[PDB]
Write a protein that binds this ligand. Sequence first.
Ligand code: V90
Ligand code: ZN
Length: 257
Amino acid sequence: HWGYGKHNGPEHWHKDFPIAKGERQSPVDIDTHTAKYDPSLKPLSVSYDQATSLRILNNGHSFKVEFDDSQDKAVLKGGPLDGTYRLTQFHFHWGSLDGQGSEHTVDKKKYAAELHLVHWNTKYGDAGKASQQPDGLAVLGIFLKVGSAKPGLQKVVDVLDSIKTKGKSADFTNFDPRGLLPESLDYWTYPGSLTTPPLNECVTWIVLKEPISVSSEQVLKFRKLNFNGEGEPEELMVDNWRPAQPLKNRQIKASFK
Ligand SMILES: NS(=O)(=O)c1c(F)c(F)c(SCCO)c(F)c1NC1CCCCCCC1
Ligand SMILES: [Zn+2]
């Protein structure tokens, strides 16, 4: 199966998922000087007031916090988007060291981690259907740098010892994702893809300019997770990021400047 290692990592994925060499793959490097300010772009509307987190899983690739998306409770709209996108889950990608871990890069700079809040367009009724559409998903990406702790992340990190190995899950209620957001909602946006198999080209990416700060203690807890299932040789879950892919025939638009 696919993963993040030498024999099954990103450079191999195209064998099982030919779309890996497609025209709108993610992530990308965001050239800040080349991104076009678009005064037509709207402020992003993040309405996470009624979010209902349900569970947290270690799936052997990352961990994901999944939400109740059976009614508009936590929705994204505006920005570059037409229509309403419901939040289904968030997850992170991170590195073995603080100088790598993000999927997107900014003028080639890598961040220590990247948070993805995954939303699906309600016009398609369910996330599976939405993933088959070019405007099906909107992923809000937030960079993490290491410095001051993020208090709103602490409830996540403190639960990770309970899901150390692949397949372990736990109930995870009343987590408020508003505590993961930076002050500014200035963003870059472009059409792209899932960053893991099946790599579907179904995502409107919205990448915030302003990172959040997390502490070294917080990211050390991410790096204590394991890729392996219990009983298998121990492999620390680190460097679960896809590198930047060719921009091809895309422009990155900026909501600011
Ligand atoms: N990274 S991402 O935000 O483009 C992303 C989606 F938008 C998705 F909608 C999904 S779910 C559809 C794939 O089966 C996804 F897995 C990822 N990637 C996964 C990261 C790899 C580790 C698995 C944990 C799930 C998220
Ligand atoms: Zn992701």
